[PDB]
């Protein structure tokens, strides 16, 4: 902000900062620097954490149950199992968080949907 408004490096680093924060999912728009004024927030980081983002994705029911499930280790993010309940899930890894391989929670979901393939 304190740079002059027609500055090239100001414009380039505004677009870089907004694109970085929108790719990490903290901001919901990438067209205002007042988003980084009063919308970037430790609560925005803490809701980009893993048990809250799988509460939102409805992998669990509540953030307490989600922290219990990812402490017991049913949740992988991508291809690697995640035991840390503070792993910050970015906007393009929210498409890859899912259950682990031999999960009893996955067997519970398939047994509910009556698609329990035992092979």
């Amino acid at each position: 902000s304190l740079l002059p408004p027609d500055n090239e490096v100001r414009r380039k680093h505004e677009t870089l900062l907004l694109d970085k924060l929108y790719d990490m999912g903290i901001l919901s728009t990438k067209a205002k620097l007042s988003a980084v004024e009063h919308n970037v927030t430790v609560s925005a980081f803490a809701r980009r954490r893993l048990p809250v983002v799988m509460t939102r994705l409805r992998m669990a029911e509540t953030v307490q149950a989600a922290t219990k499930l990812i402490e017991q280790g049913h949740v992988r993010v991508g291809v690697e199992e995640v035991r840390d309940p503070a792993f910050l899930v970015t906007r393009n890894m929210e498409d890859f968080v899912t259950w682990t391989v031999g999960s009893k929670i996955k067997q519970n979901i398939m047994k509910y949907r009556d698609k329990l393939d035992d092979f």
């Binding site: 902000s1 408004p5 027609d6 500055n7 100001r10 414009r11 505004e14 677009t15 919901s28 728009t29 990438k30 067209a31 205002k32 620097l33 007042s34 980084v36 004024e37 906007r91 393009n92 929210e94 498409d95």
Partner: protein, 297 residues
Amino acid sequence: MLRKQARQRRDYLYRRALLLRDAEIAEKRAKLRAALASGKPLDPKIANDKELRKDFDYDVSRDIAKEQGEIDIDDEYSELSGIVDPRVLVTTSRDPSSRLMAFSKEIRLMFPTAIRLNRGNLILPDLVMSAQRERLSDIILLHEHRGTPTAITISHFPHGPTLMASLHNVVLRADIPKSIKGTVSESYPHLIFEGFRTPLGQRVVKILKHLFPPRDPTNNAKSGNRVITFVNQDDCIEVRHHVYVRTNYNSVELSEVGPRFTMRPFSITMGTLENKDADVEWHLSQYTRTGRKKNYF
């Protein structure tokens, strides 16, 4: 992959709604910047908003960049505008006729980078699935009445708009003999658009000119020998496809090489071909009182 398409479409719709609210605020912020430079007194409801001034000090620069045109608007085409060659497949309805298949070939040859696909027994969600699975930019569906085509459906992918249009006055390439016609040249075509002035007209201009691969801008004003013309009167966009030689610096000889349409659009939906429940952006309002008087595009 499918979760990524759904997530990116939802993020796009949320960003568009936030842009609506931010435009409602930024119409007020552009009065504060113009009053600061010119010294004309402004409204008290604008000059006495502390949040507006406090955030204006950070958000000057994007308004200046939009005034200079240095940035581009959040759009489904602005992500890959002149970077990727848009690949596009043309398909028929389910059981095509021979003249519909030859017409599908003709409007495949209209685009230099298109491919044609045989429908056969191909369910339409799996058609959309295979398009997103092979990263196609556009699909175009064709519908015939009885050996004569009556509808196009131009759908942009991954989640872009459909333009459904009905065709009239179709004169096929496959009616004239091979002694008079020939193999159409496949060079990157120039495009001209005539008569689009509303923002809806610029919308249909965008979703029609992002079907063609981008022209090399070094010497494009004189090189290239093939032109495609979209000109609308009474919101029925009429399209010709010519090939030309510049027989002098003052004169040019045209030669009609492709099919002639006058397509009329009747539906522009912000959502792909599978979504029948997508939110429409415009539709041809028949059976209203002044829907025949009012001209869109």
